UniProtKB/Swiss-Prot annotation, chain A:
Full-length numbering of the shown residues: 5 to 180 of 517
UniProt PTM comment: Phosphorylated on Ser and other residues by TAF1 and casein kinase II-like kinases.
Phosphothreonine found at: 114
GO biological process, one term: response to virus
Protein's recorded name: General transcription factor IIF subunit 1
Organism for this UniProt entry: Homo sapiens (Human)
UniProt keyword list: Acetylation, DNA-binding, Nucleus, Phosphoprotein, Transcription, Transcription regulation
Subunit comment: Heterodimer of an alpha and a beta subunit. Interacts with GTF2F2, CTDP1, TAF6/TAFII80 and URI1. Interacts with GTF2B (via C-terminus and preferentially via acetylated form); this interaction prevents binding of GTF2B to GTF2F2.
From Swiss-Prot, chain C:
Subunit-structure text: Component of the RNA polymerase II (Pol II) core complex consisting of 12 subunits: a ten-subunit catalytic core composed of POLR2A/RPB1, POLR2B/RPB2, POLR2C/RPB3, POLR2I/RPB9, POLR2J/RPB11, POLR2E/RPABC1, POLR2F/RPABC2, POLR2H/RPABC3, POLR2K/RPABC4 and POLR2L/RPABC5 and a mobile stalk composed of two subunits POLR2D/RPB4 and POLR2G/RPB7, protruding from the core and functioning primarily in transcription initiation. Part of Pol II(G) complex, in which Pol II core associates with an additional subunit POLR2M; unlike conventional Pol II, Pol II(G) functions as a transcriptional repressor.
Location in or out of the cell: Nucleus
Role noted for this protein: Catalytic core component of RNA polymerase II (Pol II), a DNA-dependent RNA polymerase which synthesizes mRNA precursors and many functional non-coding RNAs using the four ribonucleoside triphosphates as substrates. Pol II-mediated transcription cycle proceeds through transcription initiation, transcription elongation and transcription termination stages.
Family assignment from sequence similarity: Belongs to the RNA polymerase beta chain family.
Full-protein residues shown: 10 to 147 of 1174
Species of origin: Homo sapiens
Protein name: DNA-directed RNA polymerase II subunit RPB2
From Swiss-Prot, chain F:
GO cellular component: microtubule cytoskeleton; nucleoplasm; nucleus; transcription factor TFIIF complex
Residues bearing PTM N6-acetyllysine: 21, 32, 121
Superkingdom of origin organism: Eukaryota
Protein's job: TFIIF is a general transcription initiation factor that binds to RNA polymerase II and helps to recruit it to the initiation complex in collaboration with TFIIB.
Protein name per the record: General transcription factor IIF subunit 2
Family stated for the protein in its record: Belongs to the TFIIF beta subunit family.
Top-level taxonomy: Eukaryota, Metazoa, Chordata, Craniata, Vertebrata
Phosphoserine carried by residues: 126
One Gene Ontology term from the biological process aspect of the record: transcription elongation by RNA polymerase II
Keyword DNA damage: no
Signal sequence annotation: none
N-acetylalanine modifications at: 1
From Swiss-Prot, chain G:
Lineage: Eukaryota, Metazoa, Chordata, Craniata, Vertebrata
Region (Bridging helix): 23-50
Protein name: DNA-directed RNA polymerase II subunit RPB1
Subcellular location as annotated: Nucleus; Cytoplasm; Chromosome
Highest taxon of the lineage: Eukaryota
Length: 138, 152, 138, 196, 293, 222, 50
């Protein structure tokens, strides 16, 4: 067993015939992500106000799920290269190149504050004087 | 010239609607002591509590008594500021502050001309200004900057 | 010849520190900061600056009021390695000769050297021509 | 010629009524085009609107390079895109076991509350920066390139390193908070270690 | 200009070994125009790129790959003021980088490295314009330079050798003012050896000699340590006024104005620092018989 | 757009993968295999209170790398794929991070230093010059200028003026395309002297200027 | 010196006389005592003239 003289060896392969790019989608554990309840998802480049340079939009379950923004890694490595290693039924290891690292973070749902009504103005008057009623009058 | 901020060891603000079962069980003896302390407007005063503790050496040094402090703070903020305090000879010298309203007229007439300010938040503004404003004995720009000297 | 084993007498006195000191001034000298800063300025700083970010392109304002066809003529300029000659002087005749710092002081010259740079012209026109490239030493 | 060392954070006390403490950072890739930019993050003192909460000695703000108006630091973070307060707090101090410093920043987070979207925060900085105009959208873009290029250029001049820059701003606010608590002595105005 | 009174005029402690103690204009700009000490040096500076690479091999974690709220114990590392990453064991890493520098795998007077153990931080610098000075490294409790190296320096008179060889041996190092804040520098081999009941015991560098703290003009004067210090500032100004032979080839020079002495003499009482000024070669005065009467 | 749909099969299968840090030089040695099969083998050695993981290179490709595991309790990492067929799929989830430590130490460095030579070396200033004058290899008739004259050397400097009526036809045709035109567009369009065309525009039209001397002419449509 | 060392010498007491000569640290702490007077001279001349 493991507590004894256990030795194990696996073959490692790095295929070149792959055509699909491999990317990382990272979450905070503090965000308590639950893939088990992701029934459906969308993933599209999203910068409609401004393809390969674009950040991501991740949309789970549509109107009844969470939505995230995907941001590009702060730079390529300058010494090492991150590789993805997968186990194969034959009993080998299989290694895959990372093309890119994207960071995904919480967007919120239908909250809509909108400081365009007169809230920048109201702030001028604000003495931490109100808080609830302004969110309601919208 | 010393400001209450210098005299204060520490401040705290507590949630306590029912003093008769206050979370500060050691003060509990004082609450029974102040059942007759306006026994009726305890149903009306805000459930927000400020408690202050004073440093023992520094308080004595100014030779102050609690009724002086209560009378000073009452005079500054007004009757609206309902104060009570413990005995100057207890081992933990403490001061307890609440805020009373205008009783009769506050019946949600228009929309409360305070724009619905939470009293806790207001208690910080009272706590801030109570410290920065109260000018007992010395009243202006000199305070106790003192030293005392023997000249021979 | 040293071994840090049979050696038992590391002691060394007032004499030897000056021997160290003498070797310092003898190798370095009494004005190295100036000289190293200037040597680094030519050998590094000027090359980096001409490579850094100055590619310029110009696209003619042709085909006005009438245009079609295929070409609003476009040019791009790039700058390569920098060359620096030995300090020179050009006599009124037109004949260059080496300049001697003593002569530079008597005749009141400026003791300086000519700087040359590699310039390139690239004509990636809007269609027909794309491989029109020529090298210069200027 | 002797100058103050670039790309280093310094904290100084001032006699100025408006600033209790200042964190200064000079940029200047003494290895680039040699532009400018000189960030101050300032701890405010002596004052109060009145019956606001008063307390002026927590209101941390930022001067960005010759922006015609001071900006609150949390707005800058929101402009960088980190809208979650738990995340902003983490970026300022990733050791939230200490309630006192976290309470110290707390009123500036409360002050920031009026806006919680990056676009709006960019438009806010634009109006606080740019002369009056009309459309919102160029203002957001103009504000974005300044926030990207002129805000600590030495940490990066591209989109793809906007997150890393945010980390450096936060250590800087942290560098500032340490001096205001007194956990760390002020920098010396003459220490040759901080000269070039 | 014209009336400022503050602290950038007095002699900060950190100038030690860096700028001249006494040697500053006796005039309006006292303490503002300074003169560089005798041994002091300046970095030309270079690209941090190879260090960043080396740091990455040494298991440095990248900012965007980590869990910030779960790794506060880790030391933060900075390069030219830029926050590159974090490390979880700064003592070996600091030890490794120092061994690497002393190996002359990375440039020495140009990669300065300082650790602030109180804040759990590691800061590194490789920009231009840092003033630094050379020091003898001492290890454990005993000096690292020894007799075979001196035998090579005497042989250097014909055999190929250099100060650079001496640095490649790793017996001497360059130290800038920021690092100099954290070292435990001992005045003389004497003190570091005699040290038995003394208070310290952990010296990490030593001075090659104390007299190197003085400028170039501060070096002409004999026994500056017996003179009241401003008397010595005054000589540093006056030496620059004294006349003598100022370069060899003056005769073919139409210098707009010049003064030469007929008979210069080298001084009878001289400082060792004067050998390296060549003040023997071109002296500025005469040995007078003086009577103080 | 179905192209924007993200496949969750992998996620729903709870597929796990490993994330490993390895040097560009190790992967460059791996690149020589060119996917022909394998680059080597990974070995796992487990004892009483220790686990030793390592990779060993193929004897063939070479014609011990220890692994250090990292924590992943404070972050979640997953792998999603981007196909050339424009389809996205979450192929699986990262369950572990690690770093590959080099067995060779100080001599490796020489290779590194050799590697340093490979990354860093375009010649900087470097060889100077001993030669000097070359420039101004005498054009006597400037080479571009020659080409421009050559362009001129194909029937230029003479205009119709002279064909008046046919020129009027061009004016009428042009005016059919738009109500007003700049003088410069008419000069391009009718290839005649400007002053003569002005006398025609005085004859059958008027002029209308705006801004900074920006003038357009029109045959008074009505 | 050691961090936090309030002893006389370590913080600027000169044990020696000008005749025996100053030790190296004392000399630099003496050079510091030398500046305050040179600077004081340059300021007082400007202010009093005014």
């Amino acid at each position: 067993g493991p507590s004894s003289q256990n030795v194990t060896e696996y073959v490692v392969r790095v295929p070149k015939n792959t055509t699909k790019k491999y990317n990382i989608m990272a979450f905070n554990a503090a965000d308590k992500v639950n893939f088990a309840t992701w029934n459906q998802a969308r993933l599209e480049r999203d910068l409609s106000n401004k393809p390969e340079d674009q950040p991501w939009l991740l949309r789970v379950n549509g109107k009844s799920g969470r939505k995230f923004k995907g941001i590009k890694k702060g730079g390529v490595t300058e010494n090492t290269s991150y590789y993805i290693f997968t186990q194969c039924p034959d009993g080998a290891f299989e290694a895959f190149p990372v093309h890119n690292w994207y960071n995904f973070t919480p967007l919120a749902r239908h909250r809509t504050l909108t400081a365009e009504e007169a809230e920048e103005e109201w702030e001028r008057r604000n003495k931490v004087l109100n808080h609830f009623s302004i969110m309601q009058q919208r | 010239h010393t400001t209450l901020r210098k005299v204060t060891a520490n401040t705290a603000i507590y949630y306590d609607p029912n003093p008769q079962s206050t979370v500060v069980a050691e003060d509990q003896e004082w609450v029974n002591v102040y059942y007759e302390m306006p026994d009726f407007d305890v149903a009306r005063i805000s459930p927000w509590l400020l408690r202050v503790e004073l440093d023992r050496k520094h308080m004595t040094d100014r030779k102050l008594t609690m009724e002086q402090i209560a009378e000073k703070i009452n005079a500054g903020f007004g009757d609206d500021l309902n104060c009570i305090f413990n005995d100057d000879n207890a081992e933990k010298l403490v001061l307890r502050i609440r805020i009373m309203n205008s009783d009769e007229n506050k019946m949600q007439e228009e929309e409360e001309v305070v724009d619905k300010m939470d009293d806790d938040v207001f208690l910080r503004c009272i706590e801030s200004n109570m410290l920065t404003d109260m000018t007992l004995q010395g009243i202006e720009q000199i305070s106790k900057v003192y030293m005392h000297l023997p000249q021979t | 010849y040293d071994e840090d084993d049979d050696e038992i007498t590391p002691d060394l006195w007032q004499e030897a520190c000056w021997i160290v000191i003498s070797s310092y001034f003898d190798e370095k000298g009494l004005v190295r900061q100036q000289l190293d800063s200037f040597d680094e300025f030519i050998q590094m700083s000027v090359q980096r600056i001409v490579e850094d970010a100055p590619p310029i392109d110009l696209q003619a304002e042709a085909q006005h009021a009438s245009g079609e066809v295929e070409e609003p003529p476009r040019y791009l300029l790039k700058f390569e390695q920098i060359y620096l000659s030995k300090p020179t002087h050009w006599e009124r005749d037109g004949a260059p000769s080496p300049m001697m710092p003593n002569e530079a002081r008597l005749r009141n010259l400026t003791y300086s050297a000519p700087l040359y740079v590699d310039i390139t012209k690239t004509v990636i026109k809007e269609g027909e021509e794309q491989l029109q490239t020529q090298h210069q030493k200027t | 010629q002797e100058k103050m060392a670039t790309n280093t954070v310094y904290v100084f006390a001032k006699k100025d009524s408006k600033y209790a403490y200042t964190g200064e950072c000079r940029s200047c890739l003494e290895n680039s085009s040699r532009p400018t930019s000189t960030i101050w993050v300032s701890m405010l003192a002596r004052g109060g609107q009145g019956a606001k909460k008063s307390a002026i000695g927590q209101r941390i703000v930022a001067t960005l390079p010759y922006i015609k108006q001071e900006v609150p630091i949390i707005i800058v973070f929101r402009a960088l895109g980190f809208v979650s307060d738990r995340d902003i707090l983490e970026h300022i101090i990733y050791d939230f076991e200490d309630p006192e410093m976290m309470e110290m920043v707390k009123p500036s987070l409360d002050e920031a509350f009026v806006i919680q979207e990056q676009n709006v925060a960019l438009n806010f900085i634009g109006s606080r920066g740019a002369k009056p105009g009309v459309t919102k959208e160029k203002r957001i873009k103009y504000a974005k390139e300044v926030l990207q290029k002129e805000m600590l250029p030495h940490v990066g001049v591209s989109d793809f390193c906007e997150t890393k820059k945010a980390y450096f701003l936060g250590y800087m606010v942290h560098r500032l908070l340490l001096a205001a608590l007194g956990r760390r002595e002020l920098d010396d105005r003459d220490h040759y270690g901080n000269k070039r | 200009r014209d009336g400022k009174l503050a602290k950038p005029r007095q002699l900060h402690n950190t100038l030690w070994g860096m700028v001249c103690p006494a040697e500053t204009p006796e005039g309006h700009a006292v303490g503002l125009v300074k003169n560089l000490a005798l041994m002091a040096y300046i970095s030309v500076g270079s690209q941090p790129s190879p260090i960043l690479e080396f740091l990455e091999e040494w298991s440095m974690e990248n900012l965007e790959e980590i869990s910030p709220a779960a790794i506060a114990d880790a030391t933060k590392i900075f390069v030219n003021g830029c926050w590159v990453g974090i490390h979880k064991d700064p003592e070996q890493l600091m030890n490794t980088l120092r061994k690497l520098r002393r190996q002359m795998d990375i440039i020495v007077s140009e990669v300065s490295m300082i650790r602030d153990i109180r804040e759990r931080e590691i800061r590194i610098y490789t920009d231009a314009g840092r003033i630094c000075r050379p020091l003898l490294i001492v290890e454990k409790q005993k000096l690292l330079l020894k007799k075979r190296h001196i035998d090579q320096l005497k042989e250097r008179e014909y055999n190929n050798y250099s100060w650079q060889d001496l640095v490649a041996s790793g017996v001497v190092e360059y130290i800038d003012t920021l690092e100099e804040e954290t070292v435990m520098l001992a005045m003389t081999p004497d003190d570091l050896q005699e040290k038995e009941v003394a208070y310290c015991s952990t010296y990490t560098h030593c001075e090659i000699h104390p007299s190197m703290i003085l400028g170039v003009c501060a070096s002409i004067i004999p026994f500056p340590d017996h003179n009241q210090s401003p008397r010595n500032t005054y000589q540093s100004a006056m030496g620059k006024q004294a006349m003598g032979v100022y370069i060899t080839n003056f005769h073919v020079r139409m210098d707009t104005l010049a003064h030469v002495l007929y008979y210069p003499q080298k001084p009878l009482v001289t400082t060792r620092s004067m050998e390296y000024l060549r003040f023997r070669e071109l002296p500025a005065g005469i040995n007078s018989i003086v009577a103080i009467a | 757009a179905e192209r924007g749909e993200l496949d969750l099969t992998g996620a729903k299968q709870n597929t796990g993968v490993w994330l490993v840090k390895v040097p560009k030089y190790l992967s460059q040695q791996w690149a020589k295999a060119s996917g022909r099969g394998e680059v080597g083998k990974l070995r796992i050695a487990k004892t009483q209170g220790r686990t030793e993981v390592s990779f060993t290179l193929n004897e063939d490709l070479a014609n011990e790398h220890p692994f250090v595991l990292q924590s992943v309790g404070g972050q979640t990492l997953t792998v999603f794929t981007e196909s050339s067929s424009d389809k996205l799929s979450l192929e699986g989830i990262v369950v572990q991070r690690a770093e590959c430590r080099p067995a060779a130490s100080e001599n490796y460095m020489r290779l590194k230093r050799l590697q340093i030579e490979e990354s860093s070396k375009p010649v900087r200033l470097s060889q100077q010059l001993d030669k000097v004058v070359t420039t101004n290899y005498k054009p006597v008739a400037n080479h571009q200028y020659n080409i421009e004259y050559e362009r001129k050397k194909k029937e230029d400097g003479k205009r119709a003026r002279a064909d008046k009526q046919h020129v009027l036809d061009m004016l009428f045709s042009a005016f059919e395309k738009h109500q007003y035109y700049n003088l410069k567009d008419l000069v391009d369009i009718t290839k005649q002297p400007v002053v003569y065309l002005k006398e025609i525009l005085k004859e059958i039209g008027v002029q209308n200027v705006k801004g900074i001397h920006k003038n357009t002419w029109e045959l008074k449509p009505e | 010196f050691i961090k936090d060392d309030y002893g006389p010498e370590s913080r600027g007491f000169v044990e020696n006389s000008y005749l025996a000569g100053l030790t190296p640290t004392e000399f630099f702490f003496h050079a510091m005592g030398g500046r305050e007077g040179l600077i004081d001279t340059a300021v007082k001349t400007a202010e009093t003239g005014y």
